[PDB]
């Protein structure tokens, strides 16, 4: 099955460089073109370069606000696909995509990456504290506190992705250069405390992962 | 050189309800060869990555639910949903690939639904934070309708605006709600300087404030 994935996302300073990649399967690399598209948070996609198939010998196109300072390239033996970012800066901030562009035959994005988030900042990469909010109803909601962490992303799951529905996590908000979010939960009061209720969280920034039970006051 | 412009930016539909969005083109997308137009359509739900709905502007791809129709030519365009689910949230993007390619700017579809009242809940520090020495008070708001909404702290009965942050939740993809968290910082000592913390929440749905209090105690 197609699959496509980005790596190479995180905190670059201004001026720097950033090579990130992508790696695909599940359908004949050669034969695509394969596209780089970015999105600043809260803003619109921008188509940034492609590099055609090997019916066309692989040649690179660039929308003219990236051309020649990023650069596109393959690996047809790994099925695999790059940009190289040079001297950045804060406007570069944005999740980047790879997607399976043209075959000859069809005009049409079918597949995305999940995207991998980038910024540009002299601000320093900061560990995530991550504290639990424990509070009668038919209902209970749980929450943990993701204070003070730089840059984003951070990742929060419950009970290891068992508990699903009934979350809400909430956009991180920025305040002297540290992020911070929570996420809600809410369970049946039936079974809290007396089953166990645990946030886990994740910092790739800085290979943080807690986990934090949520116990009783 | 290709420019997309998008509309409107923004709007929102009760369930059932029909919708029509609009993509113009610079310049015509017609290719004469194949008599297509390179136009097509990505839905992008919140937290997810593009996906492909429509392509050379009326073919609809694979799975997409037929309420989805594209239509149009040249150098207009559109996306119609002909009976709105709760799940079609989203901003919606069209692209040219006549030249290169290029994104329009988005049009995001909100849902109508009923006036729904807020459930709210108020979280005391960790003691793992306080022994850090800082105290952040959280209040969620969960599940309400519509999104505008004021939140009141008071300590000891007099508002406090300062420390107070504020995120709200993109809207819910099933029940089409929203949520909203409120965190108020403080040091440790200034916490312990006070007895009574209240998050109060004020939402049309009623004239009087939700309020949910507890005791330093
Ligand atoms: C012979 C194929 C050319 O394909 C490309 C290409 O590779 O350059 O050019 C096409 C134009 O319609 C040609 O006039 C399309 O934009 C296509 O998606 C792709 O960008
Ligand atoms: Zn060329």
């Known amino acids: 099955e197609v699959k496509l994935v980005e790596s190479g996302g995180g905190l670059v300073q201004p001026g720097g460089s950033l090579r990130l990649a992508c790696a695909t399967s599940g359908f004949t690399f050669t034969d695509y073109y394969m596209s780089w598209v970015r999105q600043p948070p809260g803003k619109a996609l921008e188509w940034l370069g492609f590099i055609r198939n090997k019916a066309k010998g692989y040649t690179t196109e660039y929308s003219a606000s990236v051309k020649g300072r990023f650069t596109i390239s393959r690996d047809n033996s790994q099925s695999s696909l790059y940009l190289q970012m040079n001297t950045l800066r804060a406007e570069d901030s944005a999740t980047y995509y790879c997607?399976?562009?043209?075959?000859?035959?069809?005009?049409?994005?079918?597949?995305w990456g999940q995207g991998t988030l980038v910024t540009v900042s002299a601000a320093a990469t900061t560990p995530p504290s991550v504290y639990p909010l424990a509070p009668t109803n038919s209902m209970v909601t749980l929450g943990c506190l993701v204070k003070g962490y730089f840059p984003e992303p951070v990742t929060v799951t419950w009970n290891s992705g068992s508990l699903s529905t009934g979350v809400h996590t909430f956009p991180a908000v920025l305040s002297s250069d540290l992020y911070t979010l929570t996420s809600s939960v809410t369970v049946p009061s039936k079974t809290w405390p007396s089953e166990t209720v645990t946030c886990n969280v994740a910092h790739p920034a800085s290979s943080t992962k807690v986990d934090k039970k949520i116990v009783p006051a | 050189d290709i420019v997309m412009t998008q509309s409107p930016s923004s709007l929102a539909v009760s369930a059932g309800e029909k919708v029509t969005m609009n993509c113009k083109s610079s310049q015509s997308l017609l290719n004469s060869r194949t008599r297509k137009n390179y136009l097509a359509w990505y839905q992008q739900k919140p937290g997810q990555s593009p996906k492909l709905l429509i392509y050379?502007?009326?073919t609809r791809e694979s799975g997409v639910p037929d309420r989805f129709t594209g239509s149009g030519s040249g150098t207009d365009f559109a996306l119609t949903i002909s009976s709105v689910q709760a799940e079609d949230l989203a901003v919606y993007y069209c692209?040219?690939?006549?030249?290169?390619?290029?994104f329009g700017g988005g049009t995001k579809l909100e849902i109508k639904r009923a006036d729904a009242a807020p459930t709210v809940s108020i979280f005391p520090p960790s003691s793992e934070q306080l022994t850090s020495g800082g105290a952040s008070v959280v209040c969620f708001l969960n599940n309400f309708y519509p999104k505008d909404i004021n939140v009141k702290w008071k300590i000891d009965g007099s508002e406090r605006a300062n420390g107070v942050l504020n995120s709200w939740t993109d809207q819910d993809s099933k029940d089409s709600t929203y949520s909203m968290t409120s965190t108020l910082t403080l040091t440790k000592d200034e916490y312990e300087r006070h007895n009574s913390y209240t998050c109060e929440a004020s939402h049309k749905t009623s004239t009087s404030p939700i309020v949910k209090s507890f005791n330093r105690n």
């Open positions: 692209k040219q690939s006549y030249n290169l390619r290029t």
């Open positions: 997607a399976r562009d043209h075959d000859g035959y069809y005009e049409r994005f079918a597949y």
């Open positions: 050379w502007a009326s």
